[PDB]
Write a protein that binds this ligand. Sequence first.
Ligand code: A1B5F
Ligand code: ZN
Length: 139
Amino acid sequence: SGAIYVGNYRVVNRHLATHNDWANLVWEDSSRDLLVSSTTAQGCDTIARCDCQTGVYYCSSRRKHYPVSFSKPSLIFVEASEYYPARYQSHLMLAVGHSEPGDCGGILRCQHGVVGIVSTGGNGLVGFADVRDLLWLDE
Ligand SMILES: CSc1ccccc1CC(=O)N1C[C@H](C)C[C@H](C(N)=O)C1
Ligand SMILES: [Zn+2]
C-alpha cells in the first residue's frame, strides 16, 4: 500500500484504489496501473521532472529503503491477477531489488523528488510506474 499526495491530488496504484478514490476520480489508466483522485487537504510531496536512472525506494516487506539503478519508462509484459489479464504495462521502469506482493505503493525518489511508485516485481526485480510525465499534477 501507499500513495503520492501533491496539491489537491492523491496518486495510487489503480488495482488498490478505494470507493472514495473512484467517487472523486480525476484520471485513471489501466495500462499504467495508475489512478488519481481529488483531496480537500493540500499535498505533502514534490514531483521530479528529470531523466534520472538512480534513486531510492521504500520496501514495506523489509521495512527498509534501498538504493537502485532503474531503466527508462517503457512497455513491459505482465501476468494475470485478480485485477488484470496478461498485457503490456506502459511507462514502467525495472530495477534489481527485492519486492513481494504487498510492496505496491512504495515511493521511488531521486535528488529531484518523487519519481514513481512500486507496481510490479518478481525474481530479484522490482517495477515502478513512472509519474514524471504527468505535468498537470503540478498545476
Ligand atoms: C511488487 S508486485 C510483485 C512483486 C513480486 C512478485 C509479484 C508481484 C505481483 C505483481 O507484479 N503484480 C500483481 C499485482 C496485483 C498487479 C501488478 C500489475 N501492475 O499488473 C502485477
Ligand atoms: Zn531526478
